[PDB]
Design a protein around this nucleic acid. Structure first.
Length: 53
DNA sequence: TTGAAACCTTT
DNA sequence: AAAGGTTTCAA
């Protein structure tokens, strides 16, 4: 329902839709898991704020 | 305001 | 215990 930065949205699409794990999102995107956590947290809070149109 | 490990909580 | 979320830090 919302288009934000490209970084935020990628990981929410990845983990929620195909139930992509965090190590999965990482090892496949070749990026640290902590980073997956931060991208997911901020994709969420950005949806929250911009779910109120 | 990014990337990332530490650090709590949920499963 | 391991995955999932959060708070915090340095660049």
């Amino acid at each position: 329902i919302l288009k934000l930065p490209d970084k935020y949205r990628t990981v929410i699409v990845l983990k929620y839709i195909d139930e992509l794990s965090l190590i999965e999102i990482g090892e496949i995107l070749n990026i640290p898991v902590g980073t997956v956590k931060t991208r997911i947290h901020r994709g969420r809070e950005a949806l929250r704020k911009q779910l109120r149109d």
